[PDB]
Each structure stands twice: as C-alpha cells, then as structure tokens.
C-alpha cells in the first residue's frame, strides 16, 4: 500500500498555449522560381502526407473569437503585404492636378458610350522625373474612383488620397495570386481541428482531430462573398460574436460552391512613364476595342437556393416565425457597399445589389427552384468599377497603387461563405429581421478557415504514484 | 505520425502501458522532422530573416528550448536514462488521497495532472531533485570505502573471468 | 589518495558582460498605449521578484566600470531612435519664417502680463502634398525654437534648422516613463548591495541576487534625478575620483522633495499637412491669458535637503569646510539650466532659486521648519519650452515634439543631484563649490545601477575526494 | 531551504548538497517560461518585427540554450552526461593546492576554492578527456 | 578545431584503433572549446547586432546547436545517450552487406562504408530504436 | 553473428551548403572611427589555426560548383548595401550642370598633359537645407563621371544620373580590403585541395581540411588580380570549358608583379552642404598643376610572366596555335580599362601596353634580361580616375566616391589574369586570340576560394560487430 512518484516522459497531457507558427507551402512554387507571390517565397515545403491523429475519448473546448491563430494570421498577411510593397515605387511625385479629359470613346457614343461612360478618364499632368530642373507633361489613362474632382472644374481631378495617404505602386512583376498556405506549429505544439460536422463559433467541439499544419488556407481577402475558401459540410453554418448585438458581424459559411465567372473583357495595352531615378510609374496606354463593362456570372437558381438555404438557418438561429430582409449594405466603405475581391491582380469593385435583395415569408414556400432554360436561368451580371488605388482596410495613412494588368483578365472563384450583419431596426411588431451584407475585416476572412483550428502546447513529462520505488542499490557488484 | 494520442484512454489502459512505444516513435519523429527541416534549409538556404524567415527562426529556437528543458529536468531528477523512472520519493495524501486504481484506471492522464498541478512543483522541482542530490553524495561517500575498492580491484585483477573458468569446469 | 570529482551546480559566479532584456509591468499592457520605450515589447514582469540574499558573502562591486550602464545607455537611445524613426521628418517645413511679437496683436488676452516674444507668431508659405500648391500657414515657436534670420526684425527660422533633420515625434506614441526591469538571461544573475550606505565601488556585506532589476523609470533629467530611487536614512555621495574636478559627482537623496510643474496655457492643435500622409502638428490658438511655466518647491525642504548634502560634502572634503552652492557657469542650455520632460513637453527651468547658497561653516544648521505657508513662498522656478530637442552625444539627428492639447500637470519626486566640484583658488578659504552637472545619460544610469552587477553563473565545478572511478 | 545561491557562503561540503538548486535554474528563464503571454505578443509574436528588445530577448535565449548545451556536452565528453556528481579516475595533484579534505570541505567555500584552482583547471579537464579514452580502451578490450 | 579528426579516415579497423577512442573525445572536446571561445568573444564585443555577419553568426549558432541535438536525440531513441560506441541487439540483415567482417575492418573506409549502406542506413536506425523498445518492453517485463 | 554497433564521430562528410561567418582579427575595432566591410562584427580569428592533413584521402573539388564563391558574392554585395544604406544620396544633385572652365589655365597647366579638360569647373543652380535660398557652387567633376547634354558645349550631367540613383558613400568608411577568414560553423568542414596545380575540377590527390578559410581579401578588380594568392611552381590556367570561347579564362600566376600606382596630385577636398544634415563632398581646386595617374610595371618581369602564361596556353590548345594577347574587345569601361581601387580611390588604367604581344610558338625566346635596371623598366599605364561607380549587376543603385585629399599611392601584387578566347576566323591560322576580361566579381572570389570545399560532418555511424547489447539485455 506504498506509492512512490514515477516520472513518465511522453504522457498524453497538453495545455492551451500560443506559439510562433511557420508557413509550409508546396515546393512546386519554389521550383517555378516565380517568387512573385507576396508570400510563400521562403515558406518551407509541406510534408507530402499530412500527419493527423484521432483524439478519441477527448473533449476539448474550441473558441473562434479567442483563436490567437486568427490574430497571428492577420499580422502575418498584413506584414507580408507590407514586405512586398516596401521596395516598390511610390506615387508621391504623381500628386499633381490631373487634366482628366473623358476617353475619346465618348465621341463613339454607340450605345451609352459602349459598356460604361466616365469609368475611364484619360488624365494628363506635369511630372518631374530623375531630372528635377526639367518638368515633363505626361498622360495616363486612369480609371474613375482613383480620381477626385478638385477645383469643381470640368476636367480638374486628382489621385484619390494624394494628401490623406502615401500611394505606393506595387511592383508590376509581383503576382497577387493566393496559393494554399499551411500554417504549422513547432515541435511541442499542436493545432486542434474541430472535426464536428457542425460547430457554433464558441463551445465544446465533440468530433475533434488535430494537425501539425493547417490546411491550405489561401490568404484570399474578399468582402461579403468569401471566394475560394473552405465549404461548409452538408449544412450552411452562421457564426456571430453576439447575434442579438447589431455591431457584431455575422459569418455565413455556404455548404455548396457557387462558382463565379469574373472577367475583365477589355484587351488593354499597358504603358510605363519614368518618374524618379530608376523608378517607373506603370499606367494603361489604350483600351483596344469597344470598352465593355467588367462583370461576374452566377446562376440565379443556385444563388436563389443559396439565399433560400441561409434564410432557413437564419430563421432557426432566430425566430422561425419572423420575416427576413436581405437589404443591400447601408452605405459605408466602397468595399463594404459592393462585393470586392482580387482577380488576375486587379481588384473588382462589383455591385452585389442583385445578390442581396430577395426577402422571405416565414410561411412562404420553401422549395428549391429549378432552371427554366439558358435565358430563364441566365446569369446575375454585376456592374464592376476597377479601383487601382487600394487603401489599407484598417489604416488610412497607407494606400497602394495597383499596376494595370495588360490583356484580358478572367477568374473562376468558388463562393464558399458570406459575411452578413443583422439589423433589428425596431422591426414593426418584430416578426422581421434584416441581414445586410457585411465585410471589411480581414480577420473575419481568416476565421472562416481557422474556425476549426486551435493551437495547444504539449507536456510529455508527467508524475504519478506507483507501488514501485527507486532501488537505493548503487554498487553494480554488490 | 508526430502525435501520441490516447489522451482520452484513462491511465493504465493498454495504450497508457504502450505509451513508451508511441513516445519512442515521437522522440524519433522529432528528428524525422528536424532532419527534414535541416535538409531543406541546406538546399533552399532562404534562412534570410523574412516575415516567414523570422517565424521559422523563432520556431527553431522554441523547439530546442522545449527539448532541452524537458531533458534538463530528467537529468537533474536522475531520469535521463529512459522515459519511465521510479523515484524514492513517497506520495503524500495531501498530493492525492485516492487508490492507485482510482488515480489510474479511473483518471485520464490530462485529468490526473490537473489535480496534481497544485503540487507538481513540490513533488519533483524540490523533493525529487533533493533525493538525487542526497543519493549522489551517498554514492561517492560510499566510493571512499577502502576494502570495497581493493575487492573491486581483485575483480578486475581476474576481470571476473575466474568464475567463467568455474563455469567451464561445470 | 584523491580523485577529481565533477560537481555540477556549484554556487560559483564570475563577472561577465552580456546582453539584457526589459521586463515591463503587465499593467502597461492593459493600458494598450504606445510607449516610446516599447514598454509593451518588454516581457511581463514576474509577479514577485526573487531577492534571495547571499549571506556570509563579501562581493566587491565596481559601479564605475559596470557594463550595464553602457549597455542601457545604448538601449534607451536606440528605443528613442526606432520610436521616432517612422515619423514626419519636418524636412520641407524649414523655409523663410516671418514672425510677430505675440499671437495677440495687442493686449487681446494679456499682452502686458504675457511674456512678449515667447509666442513669436511665425507665418510661412509651405507646400502641401499637392506638388503644384503652396499655402501660407502660421505657427507658434517659443524663442528657444526660433533664430532671427537676415537680421530682419520679423524674419526668423527653426533653431536646429540648416544643421540637421528635426523629425516630429509620432503623436500617438506616449512619453510617460514606465518602470523597466532589466532581467539577466538564464545562467546569469544580478547581484544587489543591501548596505544602507554604499560608496558605489568596493566590498559589500549585505549582498542579494535578483534575476531581474527593480523597476527603473528611464527618465532623462539634468542637474536633478526625478522619480528616482531613494537612499537609506542618509544622503550618499559617489564619484570615481572626489579629489578630481571633472568627474561628475553623483548624489542619491534619502528624502524625496516634491516638485509641482505645469503649463498654465490652454493650447489647441493644428494639423498642417506637409507631404502625402504626413501631418505636422502645431499650436493653433491659445484659449485665455498666457502664463509662463513654473515649478513649486518648498523652502525648508530644499534648505534641509542641501544642509544634509553640505554635511556629507564636508565629511568628504575635511570636516572644517564651507559648501557654496553656485549655479552652472556656462555651456549647452542642457547642462546650464535644469531641464526635464513633462507630459510630452520639454521644460527648461532657471533653478537659480535652488542653487543660490553660500552657508558659513559656523552657521545655524538647525533643520529649517515651516512656520507659515503664506510666508514660505513655494520656490517658483522660471520655466520655458524648447519644442525642438537635440541628441546629447550627436551633433546631427534633432527631434521635434508635437504640441499637447490643453494645460499639462506634472508632480515628479526630486531624488538626486549631479554636481561638478570646481577647484577655485578660494578653496584656500575652505569654500568648496559644487556646480550642477549632467549632460550624460550614463550619469543618470550609474545613479540607479550602482547596486547591481551582472555575473555569469558557471555550474561546472571540480573537487578532490578519496572516491575513485570504479570500472566494476 | 536555501535560495538560488543560498549556499554561496556555505563551505564546499554544505553547498555540495544544494547543487541541484542552481542546476535547476541554469536553463529555466522568465522569457523562456513566458510560453503563452497574457499579451497580444504570442510566444514573442514575430519578435515584434525584430524590435530593439525582440533581438535582445532572442539573443539572450540562444545564450541560455548554447551555454546549457556546452556544459552538458562537457559532462557528456566526460561520460557522466546524465549524472550530476561524477567520479573521475584522474589522481589528484599536490601542486593543485596541497590541502587536507577537512579544510577544503569544512572551511573553503566553492567560490574561494575555485579562485585557487583557477590557475590549474583546463589541464584537469583534458586529464578527464584522456582518462575516458583509457577507460573506453579498457572497456573495448573487455568487449573483445 | 586544432586536432579535428587529427588522423584521417583509414581502414575502419585502423581508424577504429586508439584513434577513435581518442580523436572522438578530442574532436567533441575542441568543438566545445572553440564554441566557448565564441562565448568570450561575443561577451567582449557585444557588437553582433542583425549585421550581414551578425545574422550569419546567429543562424550559424542555431544550426550547430540543433544539429548537435539531432545527433543526441538519435542516441536517446536507441538508449545510447551515454557511450559514444554502443552495441545493439539488432543483427546484420545480410541484405545490408555480405562483406567479410575482416575486410569491413581491414579493406574498407567509413566514407566508402556508408554509401553502399546509404539505402539501408536509415532502415537500420529504425530497427535500432524498434529493438530498444523490444528491450525496454522486456525490461518492462523484467520489472526493473 | 554480426550485430550492428552505433559508432559516434565516424570520419564521414557530405557536400553541403552552410551559412559561413567572416572571421577577422578585428585589429581595426580599436580604431572604431574607421569601419571597413563590417570589420567589427567579424569575430577575432583563432590565434593558433591548425590544418589537419587528410592522409590517403582523394576528393573532387568543383571550383565553379563552389557554394562559397556564391556566399562571398552575396555577403560582399549585402555589405555594400549596408554601407550605403545610412549614407547620403545625390538625388537632388542630378540637376543641369553648367560645366565650363575645364581648367583655370588652359595654357601652362594642362599644356602637354592629355588632360584636355578631364575635370570641369562645373557650376549649377542647386538648392540647400535653407530650401528657400538657392546658391550656385563649383566642383571639379571627371569627364568620365560627366555626360554632355543638348551638346550646347555647356549643359552636362552625371553618366548614370537620369537612369540610376547615385548614393554618396560615407567618407568616414575606408575601402581598404582586409583579410576576411570565411569560417564554417561546427558540424561542417572546408576541404582544401593541396595539389601543386588544380585544373579547377576533378579528383584531388593531396587533400587537407580547415576549420576556417585562409585570409581572403575582398579585392574587386578587372582584367587583373591584385593582392591575391600565388600558384605553385607553375602558372595555372583554370576554366569551366576552355575549348568553349565564352567561358572566362581564369589564370593564376606563380610569382607576384609589383604594380606601383599613385595619383600624383595634392587635392583640396572641398565639401558642399546640400539638404538638412546632408553634405556632398567634392574637390576644391588642385594644389598646383595636374599630373596624370599612372602605374609602374617591370617591363621584363611582365615579358617573362606573359611568356609563362603563353606557354601554358600552348599546353592548352597545342603548341602549334600561336598565343596572341590582344587588347580588350570592348564594352563597359569597367572591363575595357583595368579598373581597381587604390587606397579608397578607384582607378581606370589603359591596358593596351600589357596586352599587345604575339607569342608565336615558332619564335625563339630566352626569357627577358633587365640589364638596364635603371629606366626603360616601367610600362607606365595611362590611368584615368572615376568617382561614380555603377552596380556591376543592376542598372540602378550607382555610388559616388567622395574625393580623397592629397596624393593617393598604392603597390599591389599582380597574382593572375581573367581572359576571353575569341571565336575568330583565324582558328585555321592557329592564333589563340586572348583578350583581358572582367565585370563578374564571382571570378574574383573563385580565384581565392578555388582551394576550398565546404562539407557537412555526420559523426553518427553504423557498423556490424561480433559484440551484442548484452549489458542492457539484463535489467
Ligand atoms: C620579350 O622577350 C622576347 C625574347 O627575347 C622578345 O622577342 C624576341 O626577340 C628576339 C630578339 O632578341 C627575336 O629574334 C629574332 O627573330 C627573328 C624572327 O625569327 C624567329 O623565328 C625563327 C624561326 O625559324 C627563328 O629561327 C629565329 O631565331 C626567331 O626566333 C629572326 O629572324 C632574328 O634573326 C636574327 O636577325 C636579327 C636581325 O634581323 C638579329 O637581331 C638576331 O640576333 C638574329 O641574328 C631573331 O632571331 C624574336 O623573334 C622575338 N620574338 C618575338 C615573339 O617577337 C620580345 O620582344 C620581348 N618583349 C619586350 C616587350 O621586350
Ligand atoms: C557474398 O559474398 C561473395 C563474395 O563477394 C559474393 O560472391 C561474389 O559475387 C560477385 C558479383 O557477382 C562476383 O563478382 C564474385 O566473383 C563473387 N565472389 C566470390 C568469392 O564468390 C556473393 O555474391 C555474396 N552473396 C550475397 C548474396 O551477398
Ligand atoms: C584536368 O584533369 C581532368 C581529370 O581530373 C581531365 O579530365 C578528364 O579528361 C579525360 C580525357 O581528356 C576525359 O575523358 C574525362 O571526362 C575528363 N574528366 C574526368 C573527370 O576524368 C582534364 O583533361 C584535365 N585538363 C583540363 C583542362 O581539365
Ligand atoms: C537653534 O539655534 C539657535 C541659535 O543658537 C538657538 O537659540 C535655538 O534654541 C536652537 N534650537 C532650534 C530652534 O533648533
Ligand atoms: C542658375 O539660375 C540662377 C537664376 O536664374 C542664376 O542666378 C544662376 O547663375 C544659374 N546658375 C548657372 C550655373 O547658370
Ligand atoms: C600542332 O600542329 C603541328 C603542325 O606542324 C604538329 O606538328 C604538332 O604535332 C601539333 N600538335 C602539337 C603538340 O603542337
């Protein structure tokens, strides 16, 4: 009946801790030696076979809002972007009055100036390059949004954020293509994966596994609709900090991939004007062919069902006997008001009014509408304005100019999630709930993937009472 | 696999008795990973302190500290030899008032430590380390025995082969 | 017969020089504010420091050759350098500065009472982020920040302009000094003298060790040590060579003297844009009468304080001695006039009413007591503001401080004095003189680090014993 | 009982029983024991992008890691890697301070005894290195 | 490192003479020695600060330490963390080599020896630690 | 029975790539004021280095496939990046320069010297820190660093000003090369091929090993190799593919040739303050007249050394082929003119005289005799001076050398050549046309890291034995 401490190295005991994660991406990118991605350049290779064990009989508590991974991932992507644009030309010298004459395409009225009118502004200006004593008059086919009327004059515009921020042009060579990034924990640490088929933002996650490396979390930054992300399993899942609270954002994860065909159907000849010693400012030379409106194609039926599905879950989350309004964003940052995301290296400010507009009766028919022909289903095209000057999402002092991508641009992203925002607005006799689209927080975008991951440390050493005792005998012979 | 698992299995379960194996595997996985990492750093050689570079560097240091600290304790406790090591320190009812069957067959390792954490320090950081210090002293204090050394020398004088000759006669 | 016995963990330490790290209090974290000294970067301070005492020990100390002083000298200046590194450079700001006597054209507020000239309302045509736009803008520069130019009664310019850059201090960063705990890496330790009186260099009977220094506020002050540590029931005087004059004389006080300092000016902030995403902050309008900055000091307290110091100095330079407290002869305003930072605002005070004392050796030394507060006018120190500040060891690299919106209130604790013995021929009359000193971040560091020294711990040890390695 | 360096003034004998106290804090350090911090910085976050202090803390860490390792490596060369108090077969030398064990362990403190042996130390270390060579050689003959 | 491998790799036998028992401890000894010399240097200058060379030395220090650990970790996996030359219970799968033990030790150099085994060398290591477990499981039955 | 036994420290290495740390005596750290290629960082070299000779060891060394050359190149470039990072930039100085008054006295001064206005009393309406006030100043700029504009016989600018940023190097920083010992970390080793002459790639008979490389000077030169190493008993020609014409021909000499070089002028070092805390450095008149920089080569020694190289070239392409040392083909001046740095000052020396010799195997030559020891033994190299150095790899990132005060004198040790074989139509004529080359600093490092090869150290080793783990078997 005598127990003595017996130290065991390798006991299966762990503790919720935080550690410096390291990136691990496929080596193929290193072999291609493109090294144009704003990350992955020095990112180590990934274990060909992911190593995961089943934590059976285990019940770990998981909290998305308290997942330090999201905070770290946020800092990582923020720095990676800064790192990439750190050594690239700035548009600080380009800060002059811009004589923005409308594109000669206005002379070609055709049909409402072809696709769009005033979207592109052939602006001219006086610049001082490496030669300071000598000034130079140059023209740049800038788009709208990037220009702001200044003197209230007809052809008097200026680069947006000329004084509010320092416009830095991202090096044209660099490529803004998110490639599967796998965050990995160092030895003595382990990412816990909420394996539960369905899991609310916070709470004990039953079905649970673990990984030493996150799945390929593409650092895709997109507003409202989450493109190219992790699809929900079987059931669309809505996650909020405080659903009843309005300020809080609402993370809706779609179970099915709504493929979106976005393209920039304009053949573009890119130009470059030298501004500063060994510094060249890239702009657009000419829009060869009729100027057409950039647009994205999405099956109404698919989206109609997707809005039907989410609506049901929103009803389950709140009052199943309440009305539900998908009103469009109530103003705010252009990114928040209109779906935005990167495609081919150009950010597409695309309208999403058509997407978020339909409403639903608590007792309305809940059937999945089928297609009624190519013309019947058609596609939800979106008026898109390309804003090259892109400001930081959480800082005003920093803004980045975007090099024009020469030639036709086209992408095929999968819609995998949607950020919404509940607004009670004193619903008359309640029985109503508005869910305008949300976005603008990169963290929110990262949570959509780390929703299951949870970093924990490991403690192999362990002591326990055992009838056995250390034998005081020391002499080998006696 | 890099993972011990078997956390849910309560202490004493065949898995908890076969932990040694999974631990030998893990200790090995550490090299399988370290060697892999080293091989790459030899090829890519992008150890440049980049955004990921610094991360990799911090990560490398953390792993070393983890391995070193756990081994240091083992060494001071006189347990550097193998994972499992019985010690001479008896358990106090204050540390726990449960039968071995309870503390084991009934408690999982995670659950167990949780209760002992309140005493974990006094158990090993103090008494256990002291035990070894006293043992070490007694060792050399017993190595000054003159007759023992002379008899021990006699053993090396024949290198304990005389007994083998007896076996040869047998 | 004996055999070497390897003893691991022997309690033996040796003087060493190593890098140290700061461990700021976790309360600073909670505040969630950007400190210039990166108090947030500093690791959390261990709740209770371990001050294990080394009994039966007599460790010698050398405060004048301590590495930590030099190491921190660099650490504090680097912290400032990296803090103001990414801030507006105020480079284009310098141009032609046409100025007026006061922001008030006449006695609009208090021209008569207001120190005429202290405003020097200078106007200038600066270029905004738009390269093709020039704008006339006005600003207020205390005489200490404007130099007459072209000998034009109204033409002036920034003081350290032409010579070096004057980057404005990033406005978000706070300059509130937070206690800092320099901690030794594992395998290293800091030894602390507990002796109630310590010369600074020599043996120590009460010696303790700490893995972490006590909290030290990195305050930079001249002719004075503010918010510093206190001696023990005795003012202590330390100098590498007391019989030498140049060697600045460090004094640690046993009693703290309160110093209330404030800016009685309600000021506003004007963000003149100078460059894309670069906003220069200046004072827009002062709301009300203009009152010069000052500091309140007790007569008796300061009197009693000097008395004790004077005695210590006679005990240092022969009993029979007359300690004459003179002021600084001349040199950089930094070391001529007592200067200190207050709520993100530099203050140059004329401590003439703190360093004016002859005191005959044969005089009443009875501790002066307060009889009537009305009669005991709290010494008021004439204080001004030098917004542009300059590095102490470097001619170039000057820095600007953005104005703070509103009146500022400070109340630090006098805790030390820096002095410079001058061997005037009058010494033949035993009239010892100790002019105020300063001008060296190191002198301030030596005052707070005298009791600490860092030693590497060597756990490896050998010893002879009758025990022998047995093969069997 | 005694603190980290509590046996500093204690005789070599008394201090010999407290060796573990120091050995326990050779690698154990506040920065290393931080693990997860109650601060936005997580495991030194990212060295705060190599801050003035981030470097210091990083550097200070490597010195604790290399130093402890160096000390172990030594004991490892001397064979008694895991052991704390070892027993060498190196015969003692009279020149190394002709003193009786009573004075050494009941009077001289480790700090004092070291200062004396400092003059002749590295030599002893080499004598152990070659003694293990002889030991390994002898053991090899037995293995054969 | 002064006498770093003072004697070059001869026939594994001639190399496995006193040379191995000595050079090994001398090599590891001088390795620590030169590492200790670096400690005095960085203590004397303290100029190593994220410089082209400062980053080089910092990464080099980390490399050496982690490469030392991997070697020692491996010794630990097959309970050989004590003696530099530890025997195992694993027999030699003739597939690894048919070479006469004499030749292996009389007409073969370590440099050549490892290559023909570079394929199995890793396979062997796994058997070495797997057996260590078999032996421990047996020790776990010897109840000692 | 055979039981595998683990052996620690088995003498086995493997070609590896490892980060190398510079090790210099740092004897210049005491002179903290003086900084050179980060001398302070370089940890002091071991006072007693020992080369362990690898007896009965043969190894292959690929002087070209040598990672060290690559690392040195990256470290050398990064060193310059760090040195120029905090230094000033001539961005605002790229103004229209009214370059006139080539020289004060176009009569007695330049007179016969081929000066023809090398320096120019160039004046320019540039601003200063005052910003508001704009002042015109005059500074002598070398015709080499200046480029004419509008051909108005007046408007001029800096050769790279419009297309490249010029960063003024900090004057306090010296550019004297110091011995840098590239030391490998523990667990790694640098093999040393000790054959008398090494083809550059192949099995090496004599092989040794070093913990650190021998002192290697960071010398950057073109068409020549200065303060370098010497060959063994014989000039050695080294190339990746000699029979290929493009591959640069690396030659290493067995003996050294003194190259007395000096700028024989007393120069006043005028400095111009432009921009807050920014000061440009230039020349304030030349004290006295202008003497053209020149280099002294032993006429006979050179004749002999060239003959030695020629004989080896015969041994490389058949004696039948005549060795024709032609002058540089053409291209950037850096390569066209043997250009090096003297005492922190960059030279540009015409090398036509040193490369104008046809060594026809069919012509008899009994070496050369310096009977006229006094005179007629100094091939005076017409040396020009340049201050604006362009990055050897990129178009941008140029650097200005602040003028040095007084006469700049030096004496290096020619220790080899960098040559270029030409695909001429005279291949049938058998006339190996070899012309001097340069512009690739990697070659400079190869010429010194040729005898080194970094390899990993794997101490752990396995070996079958007749012994078994019986000791631990019983527990
Ligand atoms: C570096 O050193 C070399 C060697 O000294 C100098 O060049 C050689 O100089 C010698 C004279 O000292 C030259 O000799 C002359 O060559 C003529 C050409 O024929 C050559 O080839 C035939 C092949 O059958 C040989 O038989 C013959 O000997 C030569 O090698 C000969 O026609 C000359 O013959 C005689 O007549 C002349 C006068 O016409 C006399 O001066 C001679 O003494 C002799 O009686 C003679 O042999 C030799 O050709 C040179 N070689 C080259 C490569 O040009 C370099 O000039 C020197 N460089 C410098 C810069 O100093
Ligand atoms: C065992 O060793 C013997 C000796 O090396 C091997 O026999 C040799 O086989 C090779 C290759 O075909 C021949 O070139 C030799 O002539 C053989 N020598 C002798 C002495 O017979 C044999 O193959 C080995 N067996 C295995 C399977 O390892
Ligand atoms: C230098 O020595 C190498 C050998 O180390 C010679 O290279 C071999 O030459 C033969 C015949 O010329 C070839 O078939 C081989 O392929 C070559 N390489 C090897 C590795 O054997 C070489 O000819 C010598 N000379 C030069 C200029 O390289
Ligand atoms: C102080 O000195 C004065 C003058 O001698 C004397 O009258 C008085 O009693 C003394 N005591 C006090 C008030 O300290
Ligand atoms: C530059 O321009 C100013 C203003 O016209 C003039 O005074 C000055 O002489 C000019 N300098 C040169 C070099 O022409
Ligand atoms: C070169 O060509 C000549 C022709 O005269 C021939 O005699 C000689 O052998 C060839 N090769 C050598 C070794 O020079």
Author numbering:
A (entry chain A): 32 to 146, 150 to 309, 312 to 321, 321A, 322 to 395, 395A, 396 to 464, 464A, ...
B (entry chain B): 520 to 689
C (entry chain E), F (entry chain C): 33 to 146, 150 to 309, 312 to 321, 321A, 322 to 395, 395A, 396 to 464, 464A, ...
D (entry chain F), E (entry chain D): 519 to 662
Task: Quote the authors verbatim.
The envelope glycoprotein (Env) trimer [(gp120/gp41)3] mediates the entry of human immunodeficiency virus (HIV-1), the cause of acquired immunodeficiency syndrome (AIDS), into host cells. Binding to the receptors, CD4 and either CCR5 or CXCR4, triggers conformational changes in Env that ultimately result in the fusion of the viral and target cell membranes. Here we report the cryo-EM structures of two cleaved HIV-1 Env trimers solubilized directly from membranes in A18 amphipol-lipid nanodiscs. We suggest that the MPERs assemble with the gp120 C-termini and the gp41 α9 helices from adjacent protomers to form a membrane-proximal base for the Env PTC.
Extensive 2D and 3D analysis without imposing symmetry constraints yielded two 3D maps notable for their recognizable MPER density. These maps are designated Tri FPPR.1 and Tri FPPR.2, with average resolutions of 3.4 Å and 3.5 Å, respectively. The MPER of Tri FPPR.2 chain B is composed of two helices, MPERN and MPERC, separated by a short turn and flanked by α9 and TM. Immediately following the α9 helix of chain B, a sharp 71-degree turn at residues 664 and 665 directs the MPERN helix towards the α9 helix of the adjacent protomer [Protomer 3 (chain F)]. Sandwiched between the chain B MPERN helix and chain F α9 helix is the C-terminus of chain E gp120. The MPERN helix breaks at Thr 676-Asn 677, introducing a slight turn that directs the MPERC helix to the membrane. The initial few TM residues (Ile 684-Val 689) appear to retain a helical conformation. The MPER of Protomer 3 (chain F) is poorly ordered in both Tri FPPR.1 and Tri FPPR.2 structures. Relative to the nanodisc axis, the Tri FPPR.1 and Tri FPPR.2 ectodomains are tilted 30 and 20 degrees, respectively. Second, the highest LD/N values were observed for the gp120 glycoproteins in chain C of Tri FPPR.1 and Chain A of Tri FPPR.2, whose C-termini potentially interact with the well-ordered MPERN helices of their respective protomers. The Tri FPPR.1 and Tri FPPR.2 classes differed with respect to the tilt of Env in the nanodiscs and the specific protomers in which MPER order was preserved.
